[PDB]
Design a protein around this nucleic acid. Structure first.
Ligand code: NA
Length: 51
DNA sequence: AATTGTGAGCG
DNA sequence: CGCTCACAATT
C-alpha cells in the first residue's frame, strides 16, 4: 500500500506532524477545529501506522 | 500560560 | 524515514 505518513495527514489537515502524532499517541494540546481537520485527513486518506 | 516546533532517542 | 517520548523558544 502507499506509505501515507503522519506528515501527509498533517499537511492535508493543515497541522504539524507532532500535533497529529498527539492525535494518535502522547496526546496533549488539541483544539476543536484542529482535531476536526486531523479526522477528515485520517478518514479521506488511507493512513498507515508506521509508514 | 498555551501550543507548535525542535531534539533526540528507538526501530 | 517514521514515531513516541520529552522539553522549550515563541506567541
Ligand atoms: Na501511530
Amino acid at each position: 500500500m502507499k506509505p501515507v505518513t503522519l506528515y501527509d495527514v498533517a499537511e492535508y489537515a493543515g497541522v504539524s506532524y507532532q500535533t497529529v502524532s498527539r492525535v494518535v499517541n502522547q496526546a496533549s494540546h488539541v483544539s476543536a477545529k484542529t482535531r476536526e481537520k486531523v479526522e477528515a485527513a485520517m478518514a479521506e486518506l488511507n493512513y498507515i501506522p508506521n509508514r
